[model samples]
Target: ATGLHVKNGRLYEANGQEFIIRGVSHPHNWYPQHTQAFADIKSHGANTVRVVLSNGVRWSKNGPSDVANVISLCKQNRLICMLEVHDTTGYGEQSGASTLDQAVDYWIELKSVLQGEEDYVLINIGNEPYGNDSATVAAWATDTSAAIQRLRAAGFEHTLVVDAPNWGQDWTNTMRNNADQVYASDPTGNTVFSIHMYGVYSQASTITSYLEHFVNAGLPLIIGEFGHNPDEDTIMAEAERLKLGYIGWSWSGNGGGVEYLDMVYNFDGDNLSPWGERIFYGPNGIASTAKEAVIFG
Candidate 1:
């Protein structure tokens, strides 16, 4: 908590340490089995892994077992993981402070298994608090932030991420153009403002541009979720600039390029489909990895 910062658009630690949190997002630990995906994530130069939890992942009725193990794997590999609380079916359409007793229960089940593990796990209250037609993005952020507070009161000290909503919690235009209108629930600090950016020819605006916005506001930001073209140039530059952290959108089960790999970071590199072959840097780097070897061949 409060360990990330941006000085002059270059990310720094509260202790003034420099860190570029390299990471990737994956489907609910549902693909590439379990340990395999964990292993592959590390091989990809990822310092962190973001896992989504949903009904399809077989953990909805089961709880966070697979996810916990995934975290354990990240811990094993020295990869920081942000465990996202993505409940795919909780619907409280367009109302401020959408409360989910079910979600609370879900957390209860998962939290019990993960209560004491704070070293590599960051609790993302929900994937895009504004999704599902969520009412009051700010209120949603606040409510979830409050939920995290409640969890912390119960001795849960893991870091939490807040995403401002506008589909995948983009928060880019809003955080800059309408700073005050966006939610400031966890302004108490120790929370990351998660932003999901994509839909480019594998590139977003320069990190310099975004860092100027966030640092000027004096709030830390994170690329909570990203995909398309994972440009090392733009991302590393941004993370370096803001001392901020980031998570690429996904590692797909199938190494089929920009589409399926969002589910799993396929372990054998050569087998990677033409699409899966591309990476933040270029095709060659990822091909050198084992998981994606098949597709490359």
Candidate 2:
């Protein structure tokens, strides 16, 4: 493996050391002016950064040149870059959402820029690709597996990340129940499962059990996105206890009444919001647990 790969249900760096993703999400597609956000996120002790991008379906498309710049920024900061297509979010519920296939198309378009950067990039196929609908829920496994295969067929050797259905909360266990089938679809066995925690994860048992399912089954998993929900503490605590990877909801630019999800205020890395302080400096937080990826050295 030239970059990050999965083995025994854990993510390892190119150097063959376990790499737990203690990081934050950045909405670069929306706030491209915040180029400084990358270094800022690393300054707060993040080993990885899950960057939000658009596939030209819902937002202005980030072309190959722009993506190359994003990768450069991640490398300059020594943070593993997890590039995700935000256009596929809430596909079944949101009127303008793109499909997982469309997101894969976007990836194929960027292959020229992505091919040689495997060591620093993990391609998250899409962000919350499914909504909470029975029909869509049923297709999660098939669609996800197909997407993984599509990326592989296109020669994407970097580790692939698949988000859970049901708006990424996976309230119906669509992802949990079908994880094995999906994991087996990747030819390289380098697929990782990501679950976003929110209101559905208010209970400690829900958090622990969901995470333990993957741990016990020997599948790679990560908390791709989470916020200051009632169970936020449990999410971080349990991830830490289990030695699982986690990335906070975002760094800044949150809207739609979810502004509190922003880790920093006004994109000022020096100014940590209340939520920011807890995520970055609190117990089991980034400052205390995040280690720079060995590739950084």
Candidate 3:
């Protein structure tokens, strides 16, 4: 209760507790209406659930633009919020030349409204700046952090999270690694490094490699975005081994056939397909289910 709450590089105090994020990235938890499955997600054990808040639905047009009822369900079940601005609907391309002001306006409006109302909310600046370069990503973080500071200066001390540039890659690869980019100034001391990990990608590409490179820096590492096929054994293993905090990809986030998503919770309410059933649904995402492997076997 008013202690220190930070997750994925933001800060807040909600529900009489120090809120740190334990969340997923996808926002299908409740694209339009609330879902009881969030109760299911809660029983699975998650302290924070990440939801994308964009001007998508007609109802959101009038209200505070809150949709993912799982968040409220999380509040009821004792969870914090990692709210993101994911306004890619009807925009032809998910990533395109967004009219600079248009994108900025969306951030200004939502962040402005939730300024001083910090109650279990950690404002994520953006989802993922796709394929961003070193210079560009730094500029984005620098500018966005400043913009956020402008709001904070106006008295919005809620934990403010800034996304690492380039599909959430380790931003430190360029000019300023993770620490330097965010710590250019001690604005709030509630910043964190948000990283994404997928089992196949990590195991194949460099999940542990990237993680070891970053985690040793002594900053809190939230697997802000991650996924592991129930078939893949290393995802959960490494996360647990690192004792690194993590959250699943999403419950209702996939609209089907979106690259890696297994469609755990379909909005159609149809019985889960084989693919969906094998992964996330019901009480847990089945992260514990992995292929045959033993440390000493």
Candidate 4:
């Protein structure tokens, strides 16, 4: 079977099943020791796991061998792997942030390892490639389009994912307004737009409206990184109703004041935090909604 593909603004597995990504993000580059998290996450009933990798710009880079192991772990656990470059977070304002172009280069270097794993892998170009600067926000379309084009030029055919500007919140609607252009830029039409819902998406109206816009326009969208906030309920409910995909903020090992975002206690899958229960066991959550990809068979 081939890998996943997009059709009429929906993600379909290689076996032609509609695939909605109900999963959580894992910071694999920082906590390489937690390779067990892959099987643990799958045990919790998630269908996908977005693994964070760095390109050696701001953090230690995950080389080809490490990425290959990560992919193998995903397959072993029956989970789809969404690999993203973490070094590009908040590119313009955050010091030591890498550019989308650089992220593309990193993917190019890993082509040999990624070339044939399309069924279980997705290439998220960069994580939040722009800050709130109006100029940088405006350039999201052009820069993202260029990155997508470059990946295709480099002969990568896996589904590509792009994060929204404004630190992935897109408070200014940069991604919303330019989604069509960025999506059209992909020759394969296999790109999916990711919006990180945090404080800016506090209101139910805000969450529903943002998601509705994409659904109304027939564009593929996903809640790439959302936390246990006031808007999570709305986000999940709406995503279920719309048949869109949503991945939670993280599995474990969160720092700063947001350590609470960690879904499991001490990375132990047996000990799910309150937030973890909410995402995996609540109504419209992964346990009830997530279907293991047919490719796992």
lDDT (C-alpha, whole model) for all candidates = 0.53, 0.93, 0.49, 0.92
Residue pairs clashing in model 2 are: none
- For candidate 2, give the lDDT: 0.93
Error of 1 at 22 (Å): 0.6
Candidate 1 TM-score over all chains jointly: 0.69
> Estimated TM-score per prediction?
0.69, 0.99, 0.69, 0.98
Per-residue lDDT of candidate 3, residues 141-228 (tens digit)? 4555565556555555665555554555543453126456555443666655566654334453366665565556555555666654
Instruction: Compare candidates 2 and 3 on TM-score and give the better one.
Output: 2
lDDT of 1 by residue, 44-145 (tens): 566667777653322444356666677667777766667665553233443333243344456666766776665456666666555444354434544555
Error of 2 at 224 (Å): 0.2
Candidate 1 off by > 4 Å: 1-18, 55-59, 62-64, 88-104, 132-138, 171-188, 200-209, 229-236, 254-270, 273-280, 283-297
Off by over 4 Å in 3: 1-21, 25-30, 55-71, 88-108, 111-119, 133-135, 170-172, 175-178, 229-232, 267-297
Q: How would you order the candidates by lDDT, starting with the best? A: 2, 4, 1, 3
lDDT leader: 2
Candidate 4 positional error at 281, Å: 0.8
The candidate with the higher TM-score, 1 or 3, is 1
Alpha-carbon deviation at 239 in model 2, angstroms: 0.7
- Specify the poorest-scoring 10-residue window by lDDT in model 3: 288-297
Full-model lDDT, candidate 1: 0.53
Q: Which clashing pairs does model 3 show?
A: 9-192, 10-159, 11-159, 28-252, 28-253, 172-177
